[PDB]
């Protein structure tokens, strides 16, 4: 019932790893959308 | 309150009077003083009235107790379990006779506001009204603006 | 409260002593039976004489029967909290020990049987005129079956059982005020042998707290 | 043979009967002295009732914090369930998920999550199909998923669960958590357990192996609700400890020729160590991969 | 401090009323209270009811077995035969049997179309503890009842009530007792619906069997009326048709509820327990 | 400006017992793992902090006796040494403050 | 409106604010650990960090000596700054101090903080420690990390 | 003055029968003449009302009000008194059944105003009352759901009669 935040329970080793992991996924997702017209665009 | 007091519906005790009438008054307990001035009218009621009143009501057990008391009282108990205490302090013999007769005729139910001056378990013989009582029926029970066989 | 006002002619009138004049240590292994003998007996005979002095018509043989009656009736007062009658049956030294811990508790005690007849183990008297008062103490040995079921303030079983009798070997000491014209024999105390078996366990679990340490302090083995 | 509903009623009666017997051996209310050897509240002694008082009762003597945080007990250096009656005067310590080395607690939580999956698997399939519980393999926590080997009916030899089906198993698991059922433990002799699990061949073989390991041939039984299973070690006190729980994947083990053993897999985190939505998703993905116990 | 005694006395009376209301005293038997003469109370009981009871039989009817066994235990405890007191068991059995046969005759004559099961359930309701205890308590039977426990247990009160009927049967005969059963037990049906006394399940099943016995076609359920079908407060009237002729119609908040109600309406009409049936005739027999 | 009318207890209870006026339950309380006493997640344990301060005060009193006057701060580093200990190689050239007690387990020599 | 106002309003005005902060900083340099109201420690912490940077310039830098003379009201502390504190942080580029909140003050319930220069000789504060790498969650993440590293090398 | 709260720990119940259920223990305790307002103390007694003994002690330990430290002292001595005198087995198996404050006996003093005028200040005192009951805290009442609202609304629609007629 006590509130928690994302790195509350993470150890010293896991905090940098988690930050890097989620950051890379964010960048990869943004790069995957850079070609809208090759990904079944709607009628223009 | 009417708003500041309880209420009940008109009722009887065990459907009294339907098959037979049963007097609901079951017991009367008088407390008269031998010497108290306030019991003078109660002493005269016990000398000439109580005996004749007991003859007429063989279903009521009357208990007359002579003891020192400043306020003579009659306690009426009914078959439904109700207990009513009425002071006869300084009352005349005729006044006491009237009170005792009233106690004999009462059912013992609470003397409180009665919501309705009548009671019935069969208010309807022809069928209680409902919204369709006087509505006609239509062929195939079709509703307003309803296409059939589409 | 220890002492009343000073320089007062009136003093507190005590009816009992606080301890046993010469504590009777029961022989080891007595529970199993269920020169020095004479020396102890001679001391008892001497003490018995000064008991028969103030009260001529005293019988040692009758006491163990009387002692049992005093004992049973005293414990029965605990069941109904008959404290007015208990003061007649017990001394002021015994009364607090019996009643203090049961003020807000229900005690159901009963006497079932006496396994072995009661035996006056020791009879002794106080030093003459301690404060003008002489006391006689008679130690008695009782081997009887009793039933005890103590309850707490909410009517919940707290100790013992209400139907199971158990064996009790206890040497009850009685005491009388011989000088007092209205003195009587009254349960004075109980001797608990060191070898006595441990009492039956309590029902509830208990926690014994460890040392409460301040921040500066540290815990040591 | 017995119907599925009747089989549980039989096993529960035998389990209850054995529980009642062990309780009768206790003479009156004998007392044991349990010394606290933890870092906090040092020197506290608990005078408890033999074969009735559990480690949880000792925590209740201390405070509610101990009761909430204590997942496992260390009794004379041995991991001990919180609801397992204490049998002798001993030393006691309490273990939490957040200890410096919670290895034993992790295994206890890791084993209990598998036992909750088995309960879900056995009661999920239609009565037509037969579900045979095999074992809960002991896989390290770092493997990323807890697994439970099951053998399904021959009819379901080409059936693989769908995503909606996997979600259905999870919803059943979460109902078990919501019920907040205690993990009841019983240490019985091999003979008693063999009678309880006579109808199941895999349990009989498993029970025999555990009995052989121990000189006295006593096997550890656990029960949650009406589900009884044989365990490798101490379990957590209650199912309400679990907060995040999901049945991730079902794999078909090889070789498939003798019998098709299906490895059901899941991952979970307790209330004390619940993870953020984003982090939880990453753990679910790795849990879906097959784990090969070493 | 004010002079006087009257105000203080009056305030004491009120303080005693409030104290009692805060802690109502445990109830006790009326016999234990003042102004009680058992012999006088027994005689008034018969006179109130306009019944010529035999006082020996009437007194025995009130004596219960529990009161006799306890009375003897008290005698043994006090170290005190003169307690050859006859219980009401024999009178109770006689009264119970008469009441059941008498009520069965009253109900069979009045409603010839009710099957035996229905009539039995009506007799069981009229002679049940709930009804009998209500009548007994309001006829001073409980005050005159000699029992070990107070308040008198319902089973004990029911037994005593039928013992009084047994005493009347011996004293006055069957015809006089039948009037007593009519006036104090049959009256308890006033206002009651058939299925409020005869508790049944699956009325449609019972209706189908009855129509088969009568060589009538099975009833077809049809929707006569409807309102608010798609709302949270629908009204449905379901009509049961035999050979395309309406036998009964029932309302409900669902079609299933309306249909079951229609079956009950059909059963009420078949058995002659319609709300508008001829009332029970309590007039003096000619 | 003065009140036109007395405010009723009914009105006043609505104001005084409005949830905004009530004390809120704190959800950030936890047990200190070192000592077992309660603490807030973002705040140092009161019990442990007091223990550290008490030892800190004793050391500072010893520093005072060695300095023996105002305006006598040393120009070298300081080390605290407890009974049974001797200066290490990395403690040479440092003011030595000696405490007449055993090194606390939570005070790791560095 | 106070957009972008980085300094607090304390004491009796601007000068008193500096004096209040200076007395706190002087106490910190001497004792190397002090406790004071949280807001005042947070305000002073910036000055305590910058003082070390001036100390690193050396006692021969006349500007540094003037800065130290103003901020250190007890002159025996100026040698300590240049010869003790600044050499201790020779190998650091910042983060010379640590500030932690302590329980509210008893009298006025003021929010309180403890501040110290890192590397002092005093008993260590009960610092907050992150959860062990051996906990259930951290082990599951270690497995995920191991798995991701193995897939990249392949 | 009235001191009935201290007399409620002296009630001795009759022993229970073998079939009756375990009766929870009740412990009454209070502190008189606390130099604090009953109005301010009410907010603290309201907070822990219904809590467990350990949750109440935790909330009061981190509260800044002066009354908090006084209530916590009263709760600790009622907890100890429960196990020592009232035969409570587990000291954590307690919850706050009743907790309120009351007006104490107060003193009057003059408060000086300008223009030779004055007011009368009351030096306020209060009492604090607490009742501990053995067992876990009773579960909170769940908030009324839509199914219950609809079920009650239809029940009111079914209880309506034809008014002012036969
Ligand atoms: Mg200011
Ligand atoms: Mg002036
Ligand atoms: Zn701590």
Curated annotation (Swiss-Prot), chain A:
Signal peptide residues are: none
Protein localization: Mitochondrion
Q: How does this polypeptide assemble, per the annotation?
A: Component of the mitochondrial large ribosomal subunit (mt-LSU). Mature mammalian 55S mitochondrial ribosomes consist of a small (28S) and a large (39S) subunit. The 28S small subunit contains a 12S ribosomal RNA (12S mt-rRNA) and 30 different proteins. The 39S large subunit contains a 16S rRNA (16S mt-rRNA), a copy of mitochondrial valine transfer RNA (mt-tRNA(Val)), which plays an integral structural role, and 52 different proteins.
- Which disorder is recorded? Combined oxidative phosphorylation deficiency 9: A mitochondrial disease characterized by failure to thrive, poor feeding, hypertrophic cardiomyopathy, hepatomegaly, and psychomotor retardation. Death in infancy has been observed in some cases.
Q: Which family does it belong to?
A: Belongs to the universal ribosomal protein uL3 family.
**Name under which the protein is recorded:** Large ribosomal subunit protein uL3m
Native source species: Homo sapiens (Human)
What lineage, starting at the top, does this entry show?
Eukaryota, Metazoa, Chordata, Craniata, Vertebrata
UniProtKB/Swiss-Prot annotation, chain B:
Q: What's a single GO MF annotation on this record?
A: RNA binding
First-listed, main subcellular location of the protein, grouped into a coarse class: mitochondrion
Q: Where in the cell is it found?
A: Mitochondrion
Q: Which domain of life is it from?
A: Eukaryota
GO CC aspect terms: mitochondrial inner membrane; mitochondrial large ribosomal subunit; mitochondrial ribosome; mitochondrion
Q: Identify the keywords attached in UniProt to this record, alphabetized.
A: Mitochondrion, Ribonucleoprotein, Ribosomal protein, Transit peptide
The reply on keyword Lipid metabolism is no
Q: In which tissues is it expressed?
A: High relative levels in skeletal muscle and testis. Lower levels of expression in the heart, brain, placenta, lung, liver, kidney, pancreas, spleen, thymus, prostate, ovary, small intestine, colon and leukocytes. Expression is coregulated with TWNK.
**Gene Ontology BP, a term:** mitochondrial translation
How does the record describe its quaternary structure?
Component of the mitochondrial large ribosomal subunit (mt-LSU). Mature mammalian 55S mitochondrial ribosomes consist of a small (28S) and a large (39S) subunit. The 28S small subunit contains a 12S ribosomal RNA (12S mt-rRNA) and 30 different proteins. The 39S large subunit contains a 16S rRNA (16S mt-rRNA), a copy of mitochondrial valine transfer RNA (mt-tRNA(Val)), which plays an integral structural role, and 52 different proteins.
What family is it from?
Belongs to the mitochondrion-specific ribosomal protein mL43 family.
What protein am I looking at?
Large ribosomal subunit protein mL43
What organism is the protein native to? Answer: Homo sapiens (Human)
From Swiss-Prot, chain C:
**This protein's UniProt keywords:** Mitochondrion, Ribonucleoprotein, Ribosomal protein, Transit peptide
Quote a single Gene Ontology cellular component term: mitochondrial inner membrane
Which GO biological process annotations does it have?
A: mitochondrial translation
Q: What is its main location?
A: mitochondrion
Keyword Signal tagged: no
The record's GO molecular-function terms, alphabetically, read: RNA binding; structural constituent of ribosome
* Membrane-spanning intervals of the chain: none
Which cellular compartments is it found in? Answer: Mitochondrion
What protein name is recorded for this chain? Large ribosomal subunit protein mL45
Q: Which organism is it from?
A: Homo sapiens
Swiss-Prot record, chain G:
User: In the record, what terms sit under GO molecular function?
Assistant: protein domain specific binding; structural constituent of ribosome
Q: Which UniProt keywords apply?
A: Mitochondrion, Ribonucleoprotein, Ribosomal protein, Transit peptide
Determine if Transit peptide is one of this entry's keywords: yes
Instruction: Give any single GO term for biological process.
Output: mitochondrial translation
Q: Record's InterPro entries?
A: Ribosomal_bL17, Ribosomal_bL17_sf
Which tissues and organs express this gene's product? Detected in adrenal gland, mammary gland and adipose tissue.
Q: Which GO terms describe its cellular component?
A: mitochondrial inner membrane; mitochondrial large ribosomal subunit; mitochondrion
- Is Ribosomal protein found in the keyword set? yes
Q: Where in the cell is it found?
A: Mitochondrion
Task: Please give one Pfam family short name.
Answer: Ribosomal_L17
Recorded family membership = Belongs to the bacterial ribosomal protein bL17 family.
Q: How does it assemble?
A: Component of the mitochondrial large ribosomal subunit (mt-LSU). Mature mammalian 55S mitochondrial ribosomes consist of a small (28S) and a large (39S) subunit. The 28S small subunit contains a 12S ribosomal RNA (12S mt-rRNA) and 30 different proteins. The 39S large subunit contains a 16S rRNA (16S mt-rRNA), a copy of mitochondrial valine transfer RNA (mt-tRNA(Val)), which plays an integral structural role, and 52 different proteins.
Q: What is this protein called?
A: Large ribosomal subunit protein bL17m
Give the gene that encodes this protein: MRPL17
């Amino acid at each position: 019932k006590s509130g928690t935040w994302w790195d509350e329970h993470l150890s010293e080793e896991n905090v940098p790893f988690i930050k890097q992991l989620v950051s890379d996924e964010d960048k990869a997702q943004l790069a995957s959308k850079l070609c809208p017209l090759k990904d079944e665009p709607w009628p223009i | 309150t009417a708003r500041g007091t309880p209420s009940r519906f008109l009722a009887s005790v065990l459907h009294n009077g339907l098959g037979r009438y049963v007097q609901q008054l079951q017991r009367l307990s008088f407390s008269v003083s031998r010497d108290g001035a306030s019991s003078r009218g109660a002493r005269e009621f016990v000398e000439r009235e109580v005996i004749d009143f007991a003859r007429r009501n063989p279903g009521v057990v009357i208990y007359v107790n002579s003891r020192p008391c400043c306020v003579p009282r009659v306690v009426a108990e009914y078959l439904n379990g109700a207990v009513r205490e009425e002071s006869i302090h300084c009352k005349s013999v005729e006044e006491i006779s009237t009170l005792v007769q009233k106690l004999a005729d009462q059912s013992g139910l609470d003397v409180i506001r009665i919501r309705k001056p009548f009671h019935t378990d069969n208010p309807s013989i022809q069928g209680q009204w409902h919204p369709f009582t006087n509505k006609p029926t239509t062929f195939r029970g079709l509703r307003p603006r309803e296409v059939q066989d589409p | 409260l220890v002492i009343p006002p000073e320089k007062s002619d009136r003093s507190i009138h005590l009816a009992c002593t606080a301890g046993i004049f010469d504590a009777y240590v029961p022989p080891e292994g007595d529970a199993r039976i269920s020169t020095e003998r004479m020396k102890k007996t001679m001391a008892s005979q001497v003490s018995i004489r000064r008991i028969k002095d103030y009260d001529a018509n005293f019988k040692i043989k009758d006491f163990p029967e009387k002692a049992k009656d005093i004992f049973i009736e005293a414990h029965l007062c605990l069941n109904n909290s008959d404290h007015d009658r208990l003061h007649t049956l017990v001394t002021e030294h015994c009364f607090p020990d019996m009643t203090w811990d049961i003020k807000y508790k229900t005690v159901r005690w009963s006497f079932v049987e006496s396994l072995e007849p009661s035996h006056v183990v020791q009879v002794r008297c106080s030093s003459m005129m301690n404060q003008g008062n002489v006391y006689g103490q008679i130690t008695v040995r009782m081997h009887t079956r009793q039933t005890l079921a103590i309850y707490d303030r909410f009517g919940r079983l707290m100790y013992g059982q209400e139907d199971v009798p158990k064996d009790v070997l206890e040497y009850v000491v009685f005491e009388k005020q011989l000088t007092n014209p209205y003195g009587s024999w009254r349960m004075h105390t109980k001797i608990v042998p060191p070898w006595a078996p441990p009492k039956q366990p309590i029902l509830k679990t208990v926690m014994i707290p460890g040392p409460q340490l301040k921040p500066e302090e540290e815990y040591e083995e | 043979q017995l119907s599925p509903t009747e089989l549980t009623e039989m096993r529960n009666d035998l389990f209850n009967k054995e529980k009642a017997r062990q309780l009768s051996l206790t003479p009156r209310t004998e007392k044991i002295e349990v010394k606290h050897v933890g870092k906090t509240d040092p020197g506290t002694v608990f005078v408890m009732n033999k074969n009735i008082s559990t480690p949880y009762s000792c925590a209740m003597h201390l405070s509610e914090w101990y009761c909430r945080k204590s997942i496992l007990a260390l009794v004379d250096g041995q991991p001990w369930d919180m609801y397992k009656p204490l049998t002798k005067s001993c030393e006691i310590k309490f273990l939490t998920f957040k200890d410096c080395d919670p290895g034993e607690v992790n295994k206890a939580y890791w084993r209990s999550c598998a036992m909750m999956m088995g309960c879900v698997i056995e009661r999920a399939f239609k009565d037509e199909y037969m579900v045979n519980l095999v074992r809960a393999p002991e896989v390290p926590v770092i493997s990323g998923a807890f697994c439970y080997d099951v053998v399904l009916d021959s009819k379901l030899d080409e059936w693989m669960p769908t995503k909606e089906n996997l979600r259905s198993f999870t919803k059943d698991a979460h109902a078990l958590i919501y019920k907040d059922l205690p993990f009841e433990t019983l240490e019985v002799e091999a003979k008693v357990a063999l009678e309880i699990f006579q109808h199941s061949k895999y349990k009989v073989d498993f029970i025999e192996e555990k009995a052989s390991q121990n000189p006295e041939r006593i096997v550890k039984l656990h029960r949650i609700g009406d589900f009884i299973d044989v365990s490798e070690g101490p379990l957590i006190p209650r199912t309400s400890i679990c907060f995040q729980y999901e049945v991730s994947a079902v794999h078909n083990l090889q070789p498939t020729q003798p019998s098709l053993i299906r490895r059901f897999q899941g991952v979970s985190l307790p209330v004390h160590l619940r993870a953020h939505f984003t982090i939880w998703d990453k753990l679910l993905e790795r849990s879906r991969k097959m784990v090969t116990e070493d | 401090v004010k002079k006087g005694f009257r105000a203080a006395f009056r305030f004491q009376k009120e303080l005693e009323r409030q104290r009692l209301l805060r802690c109502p005293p445990p109830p006790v038997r009326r016999s234990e209270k003042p102004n009680w003469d058992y012999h006088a109370e027994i005689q008034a009981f018969g006179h109130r009811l306009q019944e010529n009871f035999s006082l020996d039989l009437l007194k025995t009817a009130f004596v219960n077995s529990c009161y006799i066994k306890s009375e003897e235990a008290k005698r043994q405890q006090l170290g005190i035969v003169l307690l050859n007191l006859k219980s009401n068991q024999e009178l109770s059995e006689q009264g119970t049997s008469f009441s059941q046969t008498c009520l069965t005759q009253f109900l069979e004559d009045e409603y010839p179309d009710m099957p035996t099961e229905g009539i039995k359930n009506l007799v069981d309701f009229l002679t049940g503890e709930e009804v009998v205890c209500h009548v007994a308590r309001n006829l001073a039977v409980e005050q005159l009842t000699l029992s070990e426990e107070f308040p008198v247990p319902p089973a004990v009160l029911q037994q005593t009530f039928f013992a009084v009927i047994g005493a009347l049967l011996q004293s006055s005969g069957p015809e006089r007792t039948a009037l007593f059963i009519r006036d104090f037990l049959i009256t308890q049906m006033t206002g009651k619906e058939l299925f409020e006394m005869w508790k049944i399940i699956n009325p449609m099943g019972l209706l189908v069997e009855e129509l088969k016995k009568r060589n009538v076609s099975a009833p077809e359920s049809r929707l006569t009326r409807q309102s608010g079908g798609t709302t949270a407060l629908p009204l449905y009237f379901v009509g049961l048709y035999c050979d395309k002729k309406l036998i009964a119609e029932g309302p409900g908040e669902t079609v299933l509820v309306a249909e079951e109600e229609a079956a009950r309406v059909a059963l009420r009409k078949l058995y002659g327990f319609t709300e508008n049936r001829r009332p029970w005739n309590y007039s003096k027999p000619k | 400006a003065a009140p036109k009318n007395r405010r009723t207890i009914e009105v006043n209870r609505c104001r005084r017992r409005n949830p905004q006026k009530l004390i809120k339950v704190k959800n950030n309380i936890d047990v200190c793992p070192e000592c077992g006493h309660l603490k807030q997640k973002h705040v140092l344990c009161a019990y442990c902090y007091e223990k550290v301060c008490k030892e800190t005060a004793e050391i500072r009193r010893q520093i005072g006796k060695q300095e023996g006057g105002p305006f006598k701060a040393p120009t070298i580093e300081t080390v605290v040494l407890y009974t049974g200990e001797t200066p290490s190689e990395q403690d040479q050239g440092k003011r030595i403050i000696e405490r007449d007690r055993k090194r606390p387990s939570w005070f790791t020599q560095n | 409106i106070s957009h972008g106002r980085v300094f607090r309003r304390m004491g009796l005005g601007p000068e008193s604010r500096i004096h209040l902060l200076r007395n706190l900083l002087t106490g910190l340099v001497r004792h190397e650990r002090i406790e004071a109201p949280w807001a005042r420690v947070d305000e002073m912490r910036g000055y305590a960090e910058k003082l070390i940077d001036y100390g690193k310039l050396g006692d021969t830098n006349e500007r540094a000596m003037r800065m130290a003379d103003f901020w250190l009201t007890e002159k025996d502390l100026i040698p300590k700054l240049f010869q003790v504190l600044a050499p201790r942080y020779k190998d650091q580029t910042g983060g010379y101090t640590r500030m932690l909140q302590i329980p509210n003050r008893s009298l006025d319930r003021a929010k309180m903080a403890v501040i110290e220069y890192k590397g002092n000789c005093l008993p260590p504060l009960p610092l907050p420690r992150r959860d062990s790498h051996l906990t259930l969650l951290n082990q599951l993440l270690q497995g995920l990390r191991q798995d991701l590293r193995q897939s990249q090398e392949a | 003055i009235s001191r009935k709260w201290e007399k409620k720990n002296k009630i001795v119940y009759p022993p229970q029968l073998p079939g009756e259920p375990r009766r929870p223990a009740e412990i009454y305790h209070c502190r008189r003449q606390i130099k604090y307002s009953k109005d301010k103390m009410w907010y603290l007694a309201k907070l822990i009302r219904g809590m467990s003994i350990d949750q109440a002690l935790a909330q009061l330990e981190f509260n800044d009000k002066k009354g908090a430290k006084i209530i916590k002292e009263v709760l600790l001595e009622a907890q100890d008194m429960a196990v020592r005198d009232h035969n409570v087995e587990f000291r954590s198996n307690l919850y706050i059944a009743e907790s309120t404050s009351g007006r104490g006996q107060c003193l009057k003093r003059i408060r000086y105003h300008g223009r030779g005028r004055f007011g009368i200040m009351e030096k306020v005192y209060c009492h604090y009352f607490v009742k501990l009951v053995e067992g876990p805290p009773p579960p909170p009442e769940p908030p009324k759901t839509a199914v219950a609202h609809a079920k009650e609304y239809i029940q009111q629609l079914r209880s309506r009669t034809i008014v002012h007629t036969l």
